[PDB]
């Protein structure tokens, strides 16, 4: 017995994604490759955001990612900032940005 | 005492793939789970709408590929489509 995630080479669950697609009332039928594609895309996005978050965490001399690191990662990357533009991250804070005219 | 499905273990696996040394807190894991659920809902809804517009009764790899192209910005969309097509090709090859 070999899982579909193992066959596709991904870490995210293809079977769970297929069940969610079937039970979510998106269409009468769900294709075989649709869960694989969706799991791959989700894994890629998670990998990107986690790579940026870990890079932020190392800069703060901390090993564990806290929500502030995720906020810094999302806001510093323009594409992820556009993707999560209307999203508020709890305990995320804001980027340090003081306007030039206010400086002495 | 009831099952609560979550992407915690998968997010941890991906994190270990990217950063073998770093870890993640409970709030950060909850945020990541919410992010995965939100992106899943976005792509699934866009795919369902695409299928409805073309009078198709199924969600295929084409629908999700178009949904990813519509949702994600440029480089993100290109790399995501590359990853998805690699995954589907490997899945078909493994049969």
């Amino acid at each position: 017995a070999k899982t579909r995630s193992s066959r596709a080479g991904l870490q995210f669950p293809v079977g769970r994604v297929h069940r969610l697609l079937r039970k979510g009332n998106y269409a009468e039928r769900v294709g075989a490759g649709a869960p694989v594609y969706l799991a791959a895309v989700l894994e890629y996005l998670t990998a990107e955001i986690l790579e940026l978050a870990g890079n932020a965490a190392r800069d703060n001399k901390k090993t564990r990612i806290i929500p502030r690191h995720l906020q810094l990662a999302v806001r510093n990357d323009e594409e992820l900032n556009k993707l999560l533009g209307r999203v508020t991250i709890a305990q995320g804070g804001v980027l340090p940005n003081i306007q030039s005219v206010l400086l002495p | 005492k009831t099952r609560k499905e979550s992407y915690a273990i998968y997010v941890y696996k991906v994190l270990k793939q990217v950063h073998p040394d770093t870890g993640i807190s409970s709030k950060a894991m909850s945020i990541m789970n919410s992010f995965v659920n939100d992106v899943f809902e976005r792509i699934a809804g866009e795919a369902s709408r695409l299928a409805h517009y073309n009078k198709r009764s199924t969600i295929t790899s084409r629908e999700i590929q178009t949904a990813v192209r519509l949702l994600l910005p440029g480089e993100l969309a290109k790399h995501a489509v590359s990853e998805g097509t690699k995954a589907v090709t490997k899945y078909t090859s493994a049969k």
Binding site: A47, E48, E51 | Q17, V18, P20, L76, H79
Partner: peptide, 8 residues
């Protein structure tokens, strides 16, 4: 062990 071509 995993690297993304977007940053590189």
């Amino acid at each position: 062990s995993r690297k993304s071509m977007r940053q590189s």
